[PDB]
UniProtKB/Swiss-Prot annotation, chains A, B:
Domain called PDZ: residue spans: 5-86
Subcellular location per the Swiss-Prot or TrEMBL entry: Cytoplasmic vesicle; Perikaryon; Cell projection, Dendrite; Cytoplasm
Residue ranges of coiled coil: none
Gene expressing this chain: Grip1
Shown segment, full-protein numbering: 668 to 753 of 1112
Source organism, top-level taxon: Eukaryota
Subunit note: Interacts with EFNB1, EPHA7, EPHB2, EFNB3, KIF5A, KIF5C, KIF5B and the C-terminal tail of PRLHR. Forms a ternary complex with GRIA2 and CSPG4. Can form homomultimers or heteromultimers with GRIP2. Interacts with GRIA2, GRIA3, GRIPAP1/GRASP1, PPFIA1, PPFIA4, FRAS1, PLCD4, PTPRF and liprins-alpha. Interacts with ATAD1 in an ATP-dependent manner. ATAD1-catalyzed ATP hydrolysis disrupts binding to ATAD1 and to GRIA2 and leads to AMPAR complex disassembly. Interacts with SLC30A9. Interacts with BUD23.
Tissue-by-tissue expression: Expressed in brain, testis and retina. In brain highly expressed in the olfactory bulb, cortex and hippocampus and lower level in thalamus, cerebellum and spinal cord. In brain it is found in the perikaryon, dendrites, dendritic shafts, dendritic spines and, excitatory and inhibitory synapses of neurons. In retina, it is most abundant in the plexiform layers than in perikarya.
Domain description: PDZ 6 mediates interaction with the PDZ recognition motif of EFNB1 and EPHB2 and with the C-terminus of PPFIA1 and PPFIA4. PDZ 4 and PDZ 5 mediate interaction with PRLHR. PDZ 4 and PDZ 5 mediate interaction with the C-terminus of GRIA2 and GRIA3. PDZ 4, PDZ 5 and PDZ 6 mediate homomultimers. PDZ 7 mediates interaction with PDZ domain of GRASP1. PDZ 7 domain binds CSPG4. PDZ 6 mediates interaction with the C-terminus of liprins-alpha. PDZ 1, PDZ 2 and PDZ 3 mediate interaction with the PDZ-binding motif of FRAS1.
Stated name of the protein: Glutamate receptor-interacting protein 1
Amino acid sequence: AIIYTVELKRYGGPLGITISGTEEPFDPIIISSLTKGGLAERTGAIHIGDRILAINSSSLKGKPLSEAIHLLQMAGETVTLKIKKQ
Amino acid sequence: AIIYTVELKRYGGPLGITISGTEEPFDPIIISSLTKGGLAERTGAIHIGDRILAINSSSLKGKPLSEAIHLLQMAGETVTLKIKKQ
Amino acid sequence: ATVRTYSC
Amino acid sequence: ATVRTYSC
């Protein structure tokens, strides 16, 4: 299991990705796409298929997509993501 | 300028990264190659050509390659790399 | 369950 | 000027 953490400085903009998931607690939250020319793509830090285990230190284990969204809405200039490779 | 940070858990094994640099303080320390099948390569979050600005929070600004070697050997189980895109 | 997509 | 490498 390859797990790593990345800290992204978004320079006032979005991370440049879309995540997908359900409200079923243990379903995984996955990175589904990368915006062309966006931060995620330019850094090459995260990719499609990657599972998000935590955001800003708050675990998503057994948490619905709505929780991930709640956290993202409170993201500051720097966002930390714990990633699990598929 | 795009900077991001990656935290890797090498445990007892290697990061699977080869860095290059001179002993001239101002010269940049760069990621020159990745071990095929190594941790760094598997994450897909580390790229050849990018510059290492800091290791485990200690800045390499004005520091020679030898300092980076020193920091990596003392980094412990978790290695945090602050990276600047090339 | 329903799968939703969120841009961020 | 001498460039060296280190593998880890």
